[PDB]
Swiss-Prot record, chain B:
The gene is ATR. It is found in: Nucleus; Chromosome; Nucleus envelope. Ubiquitous, with highest expression in testis. The chain holds residues 1674 to 1812 of 2644 of the full protein. Belongs to the PI3/PI4-kinase family. ATM subfamily. It comes from the Eukaryota. Forms a heterodimer with ATRIP, forming the ATR-ATRIP complex. Present in a complex containing ATRIP and RPA-coated single-stranded DNA. Binds to DNA, and to UV-damaged DNA with higher affinity. Interacts with MSH2 and HDAC2. Present in a complex containing CHD4 and HDAC2. Interacts with EEF1E1, the interaction is enhanced by UV irradiation. Interacts with CLSPN and CEP164. Interacts with TELO2 and TTI1. Interacts with BCR-ABL after genotoxic stress. Interacts with UHRF2; this interaction promotes ATR activation. It comes from Homo sapiens (Human). It is linked to Seckel syndrome 1: A rare autosomal recessive disorder characterized by proportionate dwarfism of prenatal onset associated with low birth weight, growth retardation, severe microcephaly with a bird-headed like appearance, and intellectual disability. Signal peptide: none annotated. This is Serine/threonine-protein kinase ATR. Phosphorylated.
Length: 1349, 139, 138
């Protein structure tokens, strides 16, 4: 309202992005009507500030944190009970757009799920409070019925009688709720109804005449059980709720679990059997097969399966904590035995069957996985059921996971299932038609045939196709109409759309709803238009509500959130059509960049965009639809299947565009025939850019630059095109578009490719070449950041290598050194210029590499490196100092001098940096002193105040400059996207998020157990949060920190822009900061413990534990035969170590939905990290270093010291690629490796083979990082760097580079006999997995790796 | 374009491929369909045929190409249902496309559909139709 | 009866996915002609022989299989069908390639390897002529 300015002023007295956070806090408010206004205002804000949010959305690969928190709380709004807000947020999410779930970051916002707080017993206070809540929640609703109100009032008496407090439990009562019991505090009340025996009626209750009603069944069975229980206090508590039960079913819901618990406590054997028979009656009763009254029996079966599931989960948990109490007498033992026998009475397979019937797919999978592994059922018999499960859960990794397990040949129906899950449409329609020929009476087959025909874009043959079966089967005409409708509006034949819509309105399918919206848009019907719009927007929210439960919720519901952005674009593209003045504020060009880079997300958006551009008929709205066809072609050629891409190309060629030819070339290039593609391109370039007419104008110059670049790229594969021809092509590209990263970058790449062969690997003649190289690499960096990981590290490597070679030749006193000296002069001059143009954050990437060369021998090269490092420090001092301080405290004197030099230059360049550095050094100094202090005897805890008084003191000074806690979320850069912010970069923010500062430490200091004892310290952040951190006393972090940077780089590739994101592949990166070469501080991953401790704990619970002397019996000398080693392994270590890890899963994650969506993440995480470890040569993966997130199931790898097959140099060679034993296999599930794991190892390897160039480039610098002690340090008598080099070079650096490149390439080089070595593709994954689970290889591992474990 | 029509009629596909490679201009849709027919590829030919049907609905050549490709793919029952849909859309074109229908029927061994599509169809010289006649009369 | 399996394996090895081809042919040769009881049929014998030979070739294609196992599979192909040109011929060819690596390009050590090669190639030319232009020259 207008007159809020004074109120805004007084609120600011108490106090865009600001407005957004206030709106968020308004959404989080409990009041519905508050939320309504808040969300309306927020939607208007988004529509108004679109062009700013779009900047906030696509500024960088990761959106600003405000947008992430916003989308999280909006997804929380979809769980809101009010329909109005959930629609208003169908609108709230569509306004912002279905951003790429990679561009989001839910880690800080998906921090919910405390769960916990078991309700074990009614006598316990937990159930007391829960039953009070049951006594009130609709006691507010029983005020209309006297006996209902009196009943809960009487139950208040019996509850408050035992639970009166005059007082901590009385305070636990809410003030209003305890006020509700105030009229019945202790005033005695009569019974509200009479007592009727439920045992008199025939059993089972669920079947006959009492079960047929849900609440009636619950009350009747509950009263029967009350007559069956023996705990007298429990009997009273259940009788007082008995009257309560005949009034509402939710009291049965809350108490029936504990009711069955107390039954199992005291009951006869035949009583238990009657109860179990009632359970089986609930389970085997499918509502569809029984013939009786409906609408109460169907919902009865549904809700009854649901409530028996909840109570059985409570029981399952009841038995778990019961075993815990037995670990914590005979009567408790007897209750444990009774509940265990009760649970085992029910067949787990029956549980899974019932859950699948009730659409509880996660419950079904959990119960079935427990079923097969426990009851030892052969898997191949239950296979088809498992495929049905994974197909229902839309988890393709299961289905394609099942096939590899299937021994028998796949049935036709299962062939259809496979073709449906994994999308291979060309082969799918053939399978559908074969099924039809086998079985034409069915309908799902014809549903499929038309479906694939839709995907391939044969739209015209679709509508004609459906009419065929329509004439043959008119009854199939209406459910088949939805496909017919889809093609119609996709064909934009609204007349036929009208015929098909008036033909049937009884279809709700998404395509039909789109068709209705579009028809109403054409024949302008504003009111019915918006009516149907709200209708469909609500329709999409319904499934998005259940999927919004925060377990990677956004990605699972992204398909729907696409539809919400779909509808938002639809709406904002129609309101102009209705008002006519008013134009859409949408930036369609940028609204697509945000969309996930996969066909199953982009294509439906572009389909509707084309439909709307058919509705809106502007003079340019005939090439715009052509451009949209072209864009769908681009995304399809990106997403594999080329047929749809080519069909779109056809539907686009009518538009006159030179981009058409670039896209046709790229598509032909995706097929592989570079020759045909280059031919078509050269033909197109001549057509659209005749050389007699310069195209220096408008979009034409851009398209022509792109086309010329594509020709220059093509020319490099076909070995016919001479070098200088490619040279001229790239030079012409540069001359065309001199403000463009791709041109200069690819030209420099070709330069570096030509260099070593033209100059015969003779560095002296390479000066001018390197000059051109670093000239174009830098200018490339000046206009974009798409390839910075390829360009910048390569540039720096080349320049510093040439400098080192010049220094060396100067000492060789050779003839070439002088011209090479002034050449190096030119090169460092160009580097200086780049330093003057580039932004600092660009150099912030690969900053560890810059530091790795500060001991550079050449002095002036070091001066330029000085000028570089200073610029980064001056702009980002905190993030710089952390990676720096390890060098500051290094043992090498020359390294120390160079670090002092760079710090002195920095403080000379800025003054407050002096205070910052002076504080941080002392801070790192006292932290070092901490890491080095010997443990006080054996006490596991230490008081920092008592021991490290100066440490606590230093942070306590106010003048102590706030130091940023080195978290991996604040040591990793965040580049800007190709578009937007890099049009105005050097102002881009490379660390978006709330920097937390060291405000203090917790006086407690844990000390873990290791050969060298790590010391955990907690850091009280300036925000108030506490982040744990551990000193590693004797390890060289330089290597582990450099590897963690590389893993973060991988996460950059993985998290965004892949199918990998769906599987939520994510390498667990935690900060690793060296404080000294000897001492490092490692960010603690909270909620985790080592694998071996986990399993040992599990084995103890089973009592089985093979002894240490038995271990000594197992170990044999290496000279002993391999076969007998294997026989010892098999016959002793295997049976004394059955696979238990699934028990750990069921324990840590009892909630079935969470259990699955966790274990699924375990397979994915261990697969991804194992794969990264293979192509990294990660070694020494003994069962202690793997350790798992006890909240999500991912695994965190630690102690990366053994790198690049450095386990082969171990006394016991490390044969296996990655730690994958039979126990870890069991945790994956009964499917084993062949399930999600292999499919997760496949996509990771594909992403590796794709991003080879950035990863290989960065790793090349890592392998050349001289700071890490590749070999152990020569003692102080003779420094390994001699104190003159300050560096150590790796002799096996080139061997490591070659081997790693080979592993990425996919050539194994395993057999010294087989030499042809055709590179493998995904059979690489199969070979690796066969290389892990192999018993022969596992056995040769020294028991330190614990292969048995 | 005329040279392409000629080489196509002379059933010399290499000539059509040459006329393709010579074209400095963009091939029109009809020339594209001719090129796909000569090159023999099926899926992309179906794509072009559907593009044409969307462009010219009142055509029997494009529908014939679409159904012939569908028959080539081996989507026999789909071919039959598609021919039936075209029949419902136009009863006058069914006589032209009935040969694909009876070819699929004989292939699918639906002798009932064979005799049915043979009774409705007039005298046709298509090898598929005569083969269906011989096969049915052999049943 | 393994004919569909072998043909699907050939279709895959043609498409380029040699890994899927090898795994499918292995699953086939497992399901049909299981290793518990040999294929007594003379027709099933020829089919299991073609399967063993195709698996040997597919193994030769990829590099993850050890040379000894490939030699063994080819020997099994020679055994289960001792009257097929293919088989003897392909095994001679495999031992032919393996010879330069085994003998380390030392003709002195090549002796018995050359003997085995020539024996297998002659046996191959005996029962057929489909490689009489590739066998007899070598
Ligand atoms: C989850 C925790 C805290 O979270 C961060 C990762 N991490 C650990 C944990 C461990 C250990 O549990 C392994 C064994 C058992 C007891 C003791 C500590 O030695 C190590 C070892 N090396 N590293 C290194 C080295 C470089 N980076 N990390 C460790 N990091």
């Amino acid at each position: 309202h207008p007159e809020l300015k004074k109120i805004k002023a007084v609120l600011q007295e108490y106090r865009l992005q600001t407005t957004l956070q206030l709106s968020m806090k308004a959404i989080q408010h409990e009041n519905v009507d508050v939320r309504i206004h808040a969300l309306t205002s927020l939607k208007e804000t988004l529509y108004k500030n679109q062009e700013k949010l779009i900047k906030y959305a696509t500024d960088s690969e990761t959106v600003e944190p405000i947008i992430s928190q916003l989308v999280t709380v909006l997804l929380k709004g979809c769980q809101d009970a009010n329909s109005q807000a959930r629609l208003l947020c169908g609108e709230c999410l569509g306004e912002l757009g279905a951003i790429d779930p990679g561009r989001l970051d839910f880690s800080t916002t998906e921090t919910q799920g405390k769960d916990f707080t078991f309700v074990t017993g009614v006598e316990d206070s937990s159930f007391a409070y829960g039953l009070l809540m049951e006594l009130t929640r609709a006691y507010l609703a029983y005020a209309d019925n006297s006996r209902a109100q009196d009943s809960a009032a009487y139950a208040i008496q019996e509850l408050l009688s035992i639970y009166d407090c005059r007082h901590q439990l009385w305070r636990r009562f809410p003030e209003h709720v305890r006020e509700i019991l105030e009229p019945h505090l202790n005033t005695r009340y009569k019974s509200s109804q009479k007592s009727t025996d439920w045992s008199g009626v025939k059993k089972p209750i669920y079947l006959s005449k009492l079960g047929s009603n849900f609440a009636e069944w619950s009350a009747s069975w509950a009263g029967y059980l009350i007559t069956k229980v023996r705990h007298d206090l429990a009997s009273k508590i259940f009788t007082c709720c008995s009257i309560m039960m005949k009034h509402d079913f939710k009291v049965t819901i809350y108490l029936l679990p504990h009711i069955l618990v107390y039954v199992l406590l005291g009951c006869n054997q035949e009583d238990q059997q009657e109860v179990y028979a009632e359970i089986m009656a609930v389970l085997k009763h499918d509502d569809q097969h029984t013939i009786n009254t409906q609408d109460i029996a169907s919902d009865l079966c549904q809700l009854s399966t649901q409530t028996v599931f909840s109570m059985l989960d409570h029981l399952t948990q009841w038995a778990r904590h019961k075993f815990q109490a037995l670990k914590a007498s005979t009567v408790d033992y007897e209750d444990y035995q009774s509940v265990t026998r009760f649970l085992d009475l029910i067949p787990q397979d029956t549980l899974a069957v019932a859950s699948f019937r009730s659409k509880a797919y996660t419950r079904a999978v959990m119960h079935f996985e427990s079923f097969i592994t426990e009851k030892k059922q052969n898997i191949q018999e239950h296979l088809g059921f498992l495929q049905k499960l994974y197909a229902a859960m839309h988890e393709p990794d299961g289905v394609a996971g099942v096939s590899a397990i299937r021994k028998a040949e796949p049935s036709l129906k299962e062939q259809i299932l496979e073709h449906e899950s994994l999308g291979l449409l060309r082969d799918a329609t053939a399978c559908y038609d074969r099924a039809i020929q086998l079985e034409p009476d069915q309908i799902i087959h014809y549903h499929g045939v038309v479906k694939s025909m839709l995907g391939l874009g044969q739209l015209s043959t679709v509508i004609t196709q459906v009419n065929g079966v329509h004439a043959n089967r008119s009854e199939w005409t209406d459910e088949l109409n939805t496909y017919r409708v889809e093609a119609a509006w996709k064909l934009s034949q609204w007349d036929l759309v009208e015929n098909y819509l008036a033909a049937d309105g009884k279809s709700t399918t998404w395509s039909v709803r789109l068709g209705q919206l579009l028809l109403s848009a054409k024949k302008r019907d504003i009111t019915a238009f918006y009516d149907s719009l709200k209708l469909v927007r609500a329709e999409q929210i319904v499934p998005l509500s259940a999927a919004s439960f925060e377990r990677g919720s956004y990605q699972r519901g992204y398909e729907y959130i696409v539809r919400l952005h779909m509808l938002c674009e639809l709406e904002h593209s129609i309101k102009p059509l209705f008002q006519h003045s008013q134009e859409d504020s949408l930036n369609w060009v940028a609204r697509l960049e945000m969309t996930q880079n996969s066909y199953r997300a982009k294509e439906p958006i572009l389909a509707l965009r084309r439909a709307l551009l058919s509705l809106n008929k502007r003079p340019d709205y005939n090439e715009m639809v052509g451009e949209c066809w072209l864009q769908s072609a681009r995304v399809a050629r990106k997403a594999g299947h080329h047929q749809t891409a080519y069909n779109a190309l056809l539907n686009a060629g009518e538009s006159r565009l030179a981009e058409l030819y670039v896209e046709r070339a790229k598509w032909l290039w995706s097929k592989g025939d570079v020759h045909q593609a280059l031919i078509v391109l050269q033909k197109g370039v001549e057509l659209c850019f005749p050389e007699n007419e310069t195209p220096p104008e408008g979009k034409n110059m851009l398209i022509h630059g792109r086309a010329m670049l594509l020709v220059g790229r093509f020319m490099e594969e076909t070995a016919n095109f001479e070098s200088n021809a490619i040279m001229k092509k790239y030079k012409d590209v540069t001359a065309c578009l001199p403000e463009w990263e791709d041109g200069h970058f690819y030209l420099a790449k070709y330069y570096d490719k030509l260099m070593p062969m033209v100059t015969d690997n003779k560095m002296e003649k390479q000066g001018d070449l390197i000059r051109y190289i670093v000239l174009h690499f830098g200018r490339s960096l000046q206009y974009g950041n798409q390839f910075i990981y390829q360009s910048m590290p390569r540039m720096l490597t080349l320049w510093l290598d040439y400098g080192t070679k010049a220094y060396e030749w100067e000492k060789a006193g050779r003839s070439d050194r002088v011209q090479m000296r002034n050449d190096l002069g030119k090169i460092n001059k160009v580097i200086t210029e780049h330093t003057n143009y580039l932004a600092p954050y660009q150099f912030l990437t690969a900053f560890s590499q810059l530091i790795s060369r500060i001991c550079h021998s050449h002095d002036e090269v070091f001066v330029v490196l000085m000028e570089i490092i200073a610029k980064v420090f001056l702009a980002y001092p905190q993030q710089a100092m952390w990676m720096m301080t390890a060098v500051s405290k290094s043992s090498y004197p020359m390294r120390v001098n160079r670090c002092k030099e760079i710090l002195n230059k920095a403080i000379h360049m800025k003054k407050s940096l002096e205070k910052f550095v002076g504080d941080a050094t002392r801070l790192t100094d006292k932290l070092l002193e901490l890491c080095n202090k010997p443990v006080d005897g054996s006490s596991s805890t230490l008081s920092m105040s008592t021991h490290f008084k100066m440490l606590k003191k230093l942070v306590e000074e106010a003048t102590f400059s706030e130091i940023l806690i080195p978290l991996q979320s604040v040591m990793i850069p965040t580049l800007p996207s190709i578009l937007g912010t890099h049009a105005n970069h050097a102002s881009h923010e490379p660390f978006p998020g709330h920097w937390a500062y060291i405000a203090g430490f917790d006086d407690m200091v844990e000390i873990l157990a290791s050969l060298q004892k790590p010391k955990k310290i907690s850091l009280k952040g300036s925000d108030g949060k506490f982040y744990i951190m551990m000193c590693k006393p004797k390890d060289d972090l330089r290597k582990d920190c450099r590897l963690m940077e590389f893993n973060s780089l991988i996460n950059k590739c993985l998290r965004k822009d892949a199918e990998s994101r769906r599987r939520e592949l994510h390498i667990r990166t935690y900060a690793v900061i060296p404080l000294n070469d000897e001492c490092g501080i490692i960010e603690w991953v909270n909620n985790t413990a080592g694998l071996r401790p986990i399993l040992t704990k599990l084995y103890k619970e089973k009592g089985v534990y093979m002894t240490g002397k038995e271990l000594r019996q197992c170990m044999l000398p290496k000279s002993a035969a391999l076969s007998e080693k294997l026989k010892v392994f098999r016959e002793f270590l295997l049976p004394r170590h059955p696979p238990i890890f699934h028990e750990w899963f069921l324990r840590t994650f009892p909630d079935p939905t969470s259990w699955y969506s966790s274990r699924s993440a375990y397979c994915r995480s261990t697969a991804v990290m194992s794969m990264v470890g293979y192509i990294l040569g990660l070694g020494d993966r003994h069962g202690e270093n793997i350790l798992f997130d006890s909240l999500t199931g991912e695994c965190v790898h630690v102690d990366f010291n053994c790198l690049f097959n450095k386990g082969e140099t171990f006394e016991v060679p490390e044969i296996v690629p990655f730690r994958l034993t039979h126990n870890m296999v069991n945790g994956m599930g009964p499917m084993g490796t062949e399930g999600l794991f292999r499919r997760a190892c496949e996509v990771t390897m594909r992403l590796m083979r794709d991003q080879r160039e950035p990863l290989m480039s960065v790793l090349k610098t890592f392998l050349h990082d001289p700071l890490v002690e590749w070999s152990k340090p020569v003692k102080g008598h003779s420094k390994a760097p001699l104190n003159e080099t300050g560096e150590v070079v790796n002799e096996k650096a080139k061997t490591h580079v070659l081997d790693i490149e080979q592993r990425l390439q996919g050539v194994i080089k395993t057999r010294n006999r087989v030499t042809g070595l055709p590179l493998s593709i995904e059979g690489h994954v199969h070979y690796l997995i066969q290389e892990a689970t192999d018993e022969n290889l596992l056995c040769q591992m020294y028991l330190g790796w614990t292969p048995y474990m």
